Each structure stands twice: as C-alpha cells, then as structure tokens.
C-alpha cells in the first residue's frame, strides 16, 4: 500500500512534538520538514530518529548543492532518506546518492518548482529511484489531470513516486490504480481537530483504494 | 566601476567552527554569509548569533529557499538577517513572498543560480523586483572538474545587462579574479579559499588587493 508520511513543518522541536506525541504510531514516515531543518538544524533528525527509531525519518533538506557534505550531515544524524531539490546540478544528486548508499538510506528528488523531463531522465540514469511530486504554489485547487499524467509518467520511468502538496483525505481516489509509494500530509494531519482521526482516515482510505 | 565586495561563506557544520574563521576575518571582508551547511547544521540561531557578534556587517543567510517563501524568509529575518537566498527553480510567488517579507525587515533577496534555470525565469525575477543574483558554479560540478568558461562570462554579462547585481561564487580562487575583469561584479564569495588558507587574514587581504587592482 502507499505509505503515509507526516510532514513536520514546524519551527522548533517542541512544536513538532505536539504532533508526534499524537500521531507518530499512526504513520509510516516522519518528515523533518524544511522549516524544521532551518529552524533547528540536523539535531531535529537525530532527536526524531531516537524517539521513533522504528519509523522512516526523512530530512526534507531540499539540498541544492554540496550534495556529499549535506547528505552526510543528515545521514550522520540517522536520517533514512533525504531530499535533493530538482534544479540541483546532476553531480549534486549523484553525490548525495553515493553517501546514502554508505548508510543504506536513499535520496529523493523533490519536484518543487521548475524542472524538465530531460532532467528526470538524468536522475533515472544516475540511479535515483524516488521522486516527490508537488501540487503547485498557486494551484492550491483540485489535483488536475496534468498532475495525474505527470505522476503516471514518472511512475512509468521507474521512479517510486511520492504525492504531496496540501493533500486532503478527499484527494486520495484521484490516484487510484497508480502505484503511489507515499502520500504526504502536513497541515491536513497537524492542523486537524483530531490529528489521530485524520491520520487514521488517510490510512483507512488508502487501504480501501489499493 | 565600484569595486566588487568580498563575502566570506561560513560553510561550517557548527558555530564554533565558524567562529574560528570570523574571529580572524570579520573585519577583513564586507559580507558574512551563514552558509547553507551552517544553517542546516545549527539552524537559524546561526544567523541570530552571528549578527549579534557583527551587527555592523551585512549578514546573509544562504537558505536557498525552494518553497514556503514567506515562512522561511520570515524565520531568517526575525533572526536578523540582512539578505536571504532563494534557489532559482522556486515558484515566482515563492520569490515574491520572500521579497515581501524582506522589504518589511529592510532586507533583500538574492536568487541563487545553482544548477538548471532559464532566461524567461530571469525576466520574471526582474519584473518581480529582484535586484541580485548569485552566479554559482556548483561545488559538486567543480569537483567533477567543471571550470570557469566563456559561457559563464557571457551569462554573467547578460544578467548584469538585465539590471541585476551579480555575485560570483563556487570554488573561487585568487587566480580566478582576472577572468572577470571589466564586468561590474557586485560581490565575490570565497569560502574554502579563505577558511582553509594557512592565514585566512592574508588570504582575504590578497583577494582585496587583487580586486582593487583589477577594478581600480
Ligand atoms: C512543501 C513540502 O515540503 C511540505 O512538507 C509538503 O510536502 C507537505 O505539507 P502540506 O501537506 O502541509 O502541504
Ligand atoms: C555553494 C555555496 O553556497 C558556497 O557557500 C559557495 O558559494 C562559496 O564557498 P566556496 O568558495 O568554498 O566554493
Ligand atoms: Mg516537506
């Protein structure tokens, strides 16, 4: 089944823990959001993995350059996965992937903002097996067909695809039949009246649909 | 015409490592950059602490903001940043969002040109009111053997012609400066070529002397 990832887009650890203390056991992947990477630094990764060592911890660092150095900082802090931003020089992505393999982790290319299909082919040739597809800034409404198409295309290229960007529970059926690797929910879990029910509804719907 | 300024990149994983540098060269350079490595290593406290130490200097947070432009720029400015970076592939409204916050704090935004981007995007930045870009040779590219070429000079001049103040960066060495002579470079960034020098003070002073000669 598609896994469920909670995005901790919080500025401080104590703010993140308001969420993890409710839903850490209700999700598969705990993301240190970019906000939290910048707010607290790599200690966020270390602390969250120590708390939840049975979960996959993703550092959403959106690495733009210095692939080897930044990825090593994250993996030394016990990250499982890290993100590299889509416009990074291809050697950045390769650098991050080489380090990831030393730690038995993985790299995802984060498809935030402008990227091209030629670049996608480069990442595939480079050995990248994961991408994160985002619904756009302004787009946030309704997951449109151009997204679905792009997602299927990335899937057909051999990427495990993550779906992200204001994801709501009701969006899930649009992706039926596509082997989505992960669905990310940040606000739709963190800011729900009941974060536990929000996470459980996501998991229930995924199980119905796949 | 004005001399290019000199910016030290603090690409240190911890504050104490950064301080081993700033205690030597704070007064030898114009801009103190909190490198991406330091922002990720220590968080945005790196910005607050460095500005507290050096309140008279321009402090740049090299956050390379890709998304959530208002939130991430506000975090940096509330930590007393002067300038923040936004990575080139960011949605135009991301850049605009960072700039709106920047103007609230009487700061500014640079677009970081690391890795792939287009001339359509650049006009978008100008129309949006962005007045600074960082022409970056990727550090990973440089390790893979990418050198400063003709194409880099053509691109830089063209960005300059569009009305951007251009910063040059990426493995910059003292001997690279003459390649840029006759172009109104706004800033040169030196990370390793200052931090890792036998004498960081003398390294910085050499960059300053060469700049004064080449652009005087
Ligand atoms: C923008 C991105 O990195 C966020 O973490 C996103 O993927 C998930 O958060 P939301 O569901 O709140 O949009
Ligand atoms: C990649 C970039 O952000 C670095 O700070 C760079 O601009 C300056 O450091 P170097 O002079 O060590 O390449
Ligand atoms: Mg994220």
DSSP codes of every residue in chain B: -PPPEEEEEE--SSHHHHHHHHHHHTTTSSEEEE-HHHHHHH-THHHHHHHHH-TTSEEEEEEEE-S-HHHHHHHHHHTT-SEEEEETTS-HHHHHHHHHHHHHTT-EEEEEE-S---HHHHHHHHHHT--EEEEE--HHHHHHT----HHHHHHHHHHHHHT-EEEEESS--GGGGGGGTTS---EEEESHHHHTSS-HHHHHHHHHHHHHHHH-
Q: Which of A27, A132, A166, A184 to probe ligand 1 with, by most ligand atoms within 8 A of CB? A: A184
Q: Tell me whether residue A80 is annotated as binding.
A: no
- Name the one residue in this structure whose structure tokens are 């602390």: A47
The response to whether residue A7 sits with its C-beta less than 6 Å from ligand 1 reads: yes
Interface of B with A in 47-86 (CB under 8 A): 63-64, 66-68, 71-72, 75-76
Nominal resolution (angstroms) = 1.8
Q: Are residues B172 and B142 in contact, defined by beta-carbon separation less than 8 angstroms? A: no
Q: How wide is the angle at C-alpha B65 spanned by C-alphas B197 and B177, nearest 5°?
A: 35
Of A88, A114, A119, the CB nearest to B121: A114
A210 in contact with B at a CB cutoff of 8 Å?
no
**Method of structure determination:** X-ray
Cα separation, B214 vs A142, whole angstroms:
56
Distances in Å between the alpha carbon of B196 and those of A88, A134, B59?
25, 39, 21
CATH superfamily of A1-210: Aldolase class I (3.20.20.70)
Q: Are residues B98 and B108 in contact, defined by beta-carbon separation less than 8 angstroms? A: no
Q: Which of A33, A36, A132, A199 to probe ligand 1 with, by most ligand atoms within 8 A of CB? A: A33
Q: Are residues B143 and B162 in contact, defined by beta-carbon separation less than 8 angstroms? A: no
CA-wise closest residue to A5 among A199, A208, A210: A199
| Residue B55 Cα, gap to closest chain A Cα (Å) | 21
Name the residue of chain B whose CA is nearest to A73's CA: B41
HSE at residue A12, side-chain half, CA atoms within 13 A, is 4
Select the CATH number that applies to the domain covering B1-216 from these four: 3.20.20.70, 3.40.47.10, 3.40.640.10, 3.40.50.150. Answer: 3.20.20.70
């Amino acid at each position: 089944l598609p896994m469920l990832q909670v995005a901790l887009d919080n500025q401080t650890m104590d703010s993140a823990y308001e969420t993890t203390r409710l839903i850490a056991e209700e999700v598969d992947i705990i993301e240190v959001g970019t906000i939290l990477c910048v707010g607290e630094g790599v200690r966020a990764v270390r602390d969250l993995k120590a708390l939840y060592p049975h979960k996959i911890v993703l550092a959403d660092a959106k690495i733009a350059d210095a692939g080897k150095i930044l990825s090593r900082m994250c993996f030394e802090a016990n990250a499982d996965w890290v993100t590299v931003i889509c416009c990074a020089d291809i050697n950045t992505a390769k650098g991050a992937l080489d380090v990831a393999k030393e730690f038995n982790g993985d790299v995802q290319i984060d498809l935030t903002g402008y990227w091209t299909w030629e670049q996608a082919q480069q990442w595939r040739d480079a050995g990248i097996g994961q991408v994160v597809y985002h619904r756009s800034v302004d787009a946030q409404v309704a997951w449109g067909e151009a997204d679905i198409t792009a997602i299927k295309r990335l899937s057909d290229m051999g990427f495990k695809v993550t779906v992200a960007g204001g994801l709501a529970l009701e969006d899930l059926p649009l992706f039926k039949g596509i082997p989505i690797h992960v669905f990310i929910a940040g606000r739709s879990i963190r800011d729900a009246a009941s974060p536990v029910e929000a996470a459980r509804q996501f998991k229930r719907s995924i199980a119905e649909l796949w």
